[PDB]
Amino acid sequence: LQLELDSFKEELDKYFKNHT
Amino acid sequence: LQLELDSFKEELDKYFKNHT
């Protein structure tokens, strides 16, 4: 569970990077 | 797990659209 949670957290930053 | 992860992804997608 922790690895996929970290992967989802990493994917979360993609939308923040694309918003700029 | 995958279905609820996709649901969380779809919910996350709404916050960036609401922020704009």
From Swiss-Prot, chains A, B:
Residues with attached carbohydrate: 18
Superkingdom of this protein's organism: Viruses
Function: Subunit of the fusion protein that is processed upon entry into the host cell. Mediates fusion of the virion and cellular membranes by functioning as a class I viral fusion protein. Contains a viral fusion peptide that is unmasked after S2 cleavage. This cleavage can occur at the cell membrane by host TMPRSS2 or during endocytosis by host CSTL. In either case, this triggers an extensive and irreversible conformational change that leads to fusion of the viral envelope with the cellular cytoplasmic membrane, releasing viral genomic RNA into the host cell cytoplasm.
Name recorded for this polypeptide: Spike protein S2'
Gene (UniProt): S
